[PDB]
């Protein structure tokens, strides 16, 4: 671990001292020491790395994006400076990117991350990290290049494999992603044991018919990523009551269900009207959930925020729902019409979060053909009647009627969730 150019060995005694103050928690004192050792040796890398590290720690205790922001500069400044050992160079700059990501300036992170591949082109671990920078801003095709290059040279990088498998699954290369996900998981390299790759491998094997897919859901549970082999959401609050099927009473939203079940024809009529006259507002499902068929959706609220244009189109419905913040405010849920046509089979899948239940309201239900399965039980809609399930559980749908099928979906906060918890949780 090379951390002193020679000139930093010269002045080690003073450097040791400052860091002393910091490993004993006197982070204001420590920062100021390093500040004066840095004004006193403006070229000392370790002094500068000293200021930057205490600026980190201060920013953790102060829980302050600004303290942090100013340390990201100082980490940069260390690598701007001459005769910087390579260890301090990499660590300083890696620190910078991994923090920039924290604060969410990914554009920024990536540039530090590509600076870092230029500086060390023989580091597969740093390519790997850059590939991650690409995924976090959605740039899948560059992520795919990084990992293909890594794997060309270290073909067993456990970490490039789950990530490569992640990326091909995302492109619906379901057949090909499996061996990468599987191999990448068994590798045990550091980074493989994420529930994300567990979730996605078992899904891939399901969509190709592989019965082994539930041996891996038991596993991902038994490593502790999934609540259960049936319930594999990953954005959760540990605690919440977990059943696939609820009753209006069980949820304590008995009023919402009522304002829905008694005003169901209007809800329908407004969505039929949009179908007949504003069909553009209905949008194709774009999350790769369909084996086959047509399924479009007209969304009125998303992440607890209302869509004004959409609500010009079902306007009495948006007024009637504004009465209920348990759903209009679910920043982890949607409210939307969902029209599904014959020939349709929706792959088994899970939502992202346990933090929400999902109400369906029958609006136009054809008399045969429309199954939904959530775990062990199978159920059907009734017009003017509401169903409730925990979409964090595994659900699958078929539409094999002779005409279209329309329902209203209304997401509510998981009812055991307390007010401050609805204020805090990240929106999804």
């Amino acid at each position: 671990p090379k951390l002193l150019n020679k000139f930093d060995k010269t002045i080690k005694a003073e450097l040791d001292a400052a860091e002393k103050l910091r490993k004993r928690g006197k982070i204001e004192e420590a920062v100021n020491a390093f500040k004066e050792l840095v004004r006193k040796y403006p070229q000392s890398p370790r002094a500068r790395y000293g200021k930057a590290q205490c600026e980190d720690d201060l920013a953790e205790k102060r829980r302050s994006n600004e303290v942090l922001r100013g340390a990201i500069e100082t980490y940069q400044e260390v690598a701007s400076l001459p005769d910087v050992p390579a260890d301090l160079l990499k660590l300083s700059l890696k620190r910078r990117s991994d923090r920039q990501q924290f604060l969410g300036h990914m554009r920024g992170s990536l540039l530090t991350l590509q600076r870092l591949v230029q500086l060390f082109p023989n580091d597969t671990s740093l390519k790997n990290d850059l590939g991650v920078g690409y995924l976090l801003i959605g740039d899948n095709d560059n992520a795919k290049k990084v990992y293909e290059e890594v794997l060309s040279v270290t073909p067993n990088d456990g970490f490039a494999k789950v990530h490569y498998g992640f990326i091909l699954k995302a492109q619906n290369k379901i057949a090909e992603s499996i061996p990468y996900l599987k191999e990448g998981i068994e590798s045990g390299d550091p980074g493989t044991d994420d529930g994300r790759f567990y979730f996605h491998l078992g899904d891939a094997m399901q969509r190709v018919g592989n019965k082994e897919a539930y041996k891996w859901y038991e596993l991902g549970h038994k490593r502790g990523h999934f609540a259960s082999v049936w319930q594999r959401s990953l954005y959760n609050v540990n605690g919440l009551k977990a059943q696939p099927w609820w009753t209006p009473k069980e949820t304590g939203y008995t009023e919402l269900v009522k304002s829905l079940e008694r005003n169901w024809k209007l809800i329908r009529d407004e969505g039929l009207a949009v179908m007949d006259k504003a069909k553009g507002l209905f949008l194709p499902e774009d999350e790769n959930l369909r084996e086959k068929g047509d399924w479009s959706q007209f969304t009125l609220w998303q992440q607890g925020r209302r869509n004004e244009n959409a609500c010009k189109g079902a306007p009495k419905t948006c007024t009637l729902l504004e009465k209920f913040p348990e759903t209009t405010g679910c920043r982890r849920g949607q409210i939307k019409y969902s029209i599904m046509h014959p020939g349709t089979h929706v792959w088994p899948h899970t939502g992202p979060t346990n933090c929400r239940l999902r109400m369906h309201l029958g609006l136009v239900i054809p008399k045969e053909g429309c199954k939904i399965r959530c775990a062990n039980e199978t159920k059907t809609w009734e017009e003017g009647k509401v169903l409730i399930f925990d979409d964090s559980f595994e659900h699958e749908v078929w539409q094999d009627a002779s005409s279209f099928r329309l329902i209203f979906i209304v997401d509510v906060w998981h009812p055991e969730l307390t007010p401050q918890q609805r204020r805090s949780l990240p929106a999804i």
Binding site: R63, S64, N65, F102, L103, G104, H105, L135, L136, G138, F166, A170, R196, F199, H200, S233, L234, Y235, E285, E287, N288, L289, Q302, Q303, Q334, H349, T350, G351, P352, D391, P426, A427, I428
Partner: peptide
């Protein structure tokens, strides 16, 4: 991308600060 009915994005929440 958002994760609305599924979990196909690499991160579904975009944290950005404390």
């Amino acid at each position: 991308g958002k994760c609305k009915d599924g979990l196909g994005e690499y991160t579904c929440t975009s944290l950005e600060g404390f």
